[PDB]
Design a protein around this nucleic acid. Structure first.
Ligand SMILES: Nc1nc2c(ncn2[C@H]2C[C@H](O)[C@@H](COP(=O)(O)OP(=O)(O)OP(=O)(O)O)O2)c(=O)[nH]1
Ligand SMILES: [Ca+2]
Ligand SMILES: [K+]
Length: 425
DNA sequence: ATTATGACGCT
């Protein structure tokens, strides 16, 4: 009882820009706004691969990783924006810069962990504490939560349902207790309304957010009510929420580990995990995964929000699928040079912006017919931001993969250069 | 012939 720590010490938020690349194109081109539209890469093969879909378009069944010519079968009025092409490859600079706009606004409110180009985690514990002192016992009005849902409420139309649930939550709230986790979450949610308002004011971008006591719950909460809405998942809401939550829906259980949890334990939903002892879970899935699962199925997770706003690596990738696979030496060299030239641009810009240099170059390749997604991964020293030297070094490091007797065999289906191991500058 | 990334764990 009094000694089971309940994982209620922190207020963590997960903010996620709704269909981010689509929003970036729709800010730049108003004719796309409030319309079924998607963002594609390339156009020749089946109209290009779709990588982002507005919610209007999603209502027609358009999804990511779907050819544009097929999405047009589901949605004949679909509008398409194309990713920039530079040096023969997709170039995602417009979106990295829009992402930095968003991240810099979020960093004004709290410390953020950049989880990907369009989502960040937020540690709000200090901010909530400050705000609770600033209220001086004043009760939190529903007007401060115009877009917040309270998961599991109401108990016992859609905006109506939302406001009913918020009303029940706020009526139950104990505002004189500056240490009640639920109050803390509620103030976190007010601050997240403010963050999202500032993001939309200052960028035009809308997002969704989850507010809970840890990153996994925040992330799960954020997906509950999209787009342009935020969701508070309280500790108390976890048993019901998890009682029908497929295991695959939890961050990091969507793959082979989730599938083996399901198969080995003979369960479907996250809450069923609570019936196993910690030792049992460790015995099946290893000591780290076991401990993490034992706590996570109880709503408890300790992974900190890392203070890291900038990416840890800067990478350049291109697949060469099917017949476009590279089969000559000139081909591999020219594409390694294209890759190294984009990477050098991004790296010099990073050095000027963020006062740091990369020190290690990683070269990954895939060879045709190889089952694995990386056929080889070798690193070398990165000592100057020079595209020609970088491409020469990558070739030097992969050349003993050619089995020909000017040809390249097996032909290459992927090149990949990554600058890593940053040091202050 | 979803592709372009990017974080992190394991050994
Ligand atoms: N090139 C490329 N970009 C991707 C891929 N997957 C996602 N992206 C880009 C486009 C998305 O807008 C953005 C963020 O990914 P998300 O999972 O958050 O989806 P998105 O923001 O589009 O939609 P959402 O509103 O969050 O459901 O990253 C991919 O496989 N390849
Ligand atoms: Ca998103
Ligand atoms: K994301």
């Amino acid at each position: 009882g009094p000694h089971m720590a309940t994982g209620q010490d922190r207020v963590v938020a997960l903010v996620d820009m709704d269909c981010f690349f689509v929003q970036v194109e729709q800010r730049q081109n108003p004719h796309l706004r409030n319309k079924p539209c998607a963002v594609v890469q390339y156009k020749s093969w089946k109209g290009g691969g779709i990588i982002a879909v507005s919610y209007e378009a999603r209502a027609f069944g358009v999804t990511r990783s779907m050819w544009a010519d097929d999405a047009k079968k589901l949605c004949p009025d679909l509008l398409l924006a194309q990713v920039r092409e530079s040096r023969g490859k997709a170039n995602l600079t417009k979106y990295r810069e829009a992402s930095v706009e968003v991240m810099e606004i979020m960093s004004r409110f709290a410390v953020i962990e950049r989880a990907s180009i369009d989502e960040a985690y937020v540690d709000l514990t200090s901010a909530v504490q400050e705000r609770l002192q600033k209220l001086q016992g004043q009760p939190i009005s529903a007007d401060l939560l115009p877009s917040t849902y309270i998961e599991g409420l109401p108990q016992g139309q859609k905006e109506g349902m939302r406001k009913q649930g918020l009303f029940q939550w706020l009526d139950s709230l104990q505002i004189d207790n500056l240490t009640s986790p639920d109050l803390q979450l509620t103030v976190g949610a007010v601050i997240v309304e403010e963050m999202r308002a500032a993001i939309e004011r200052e960028t035009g971008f809308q997002c969704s957010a989850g507010i809970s006591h840890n990153k996994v719950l925040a992330k799960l909460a954020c997906g509950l009510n999209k787009p342009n809405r935020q969701t508070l998942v309280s500790h108390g809401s976890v048993p019901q929420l998890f009682s029908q939550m497929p295991i695959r829906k939890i961050r990091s259980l969507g793959g082979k580990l989730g599938a083996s949890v399901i198969e080995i334990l003979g369960i479907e939903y996250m809450g069923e995990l609570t019936q196993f002892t910690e030792s049992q879970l460790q015995s099946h899935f290893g000591e780290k995964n076991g401990s993490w699962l034992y706590a996570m199925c109880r709503g408890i997770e300790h992974d900190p929000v890392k203070p890291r706003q900038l990416p840890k690596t800067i990478g350049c990738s291109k697949n060469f699928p099917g017949k476009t696979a590279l089969a000559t030496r000139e081909q591999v060299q020219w594409w390694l040079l294209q890759l190294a030239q984009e990477l050098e641009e991004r790296l010099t810009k990073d050095r000027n912006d963020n006062d740091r240099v990369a020190t290690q170059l990683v070269v990954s390749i895939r060879v045709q017919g190889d089952k694995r997604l990386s056929s080889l991964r070798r690193c070398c020293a990165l000592t100057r931001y020079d595209a020609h030297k970088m491409s020469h070094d990558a070739f030097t490091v992969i050349k003993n993969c050619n089995t020909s007797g000017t040809e390249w065999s097996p032909p290459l289906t992927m090149l990949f250069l990554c600058a890593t191991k940053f040091s202050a500058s």
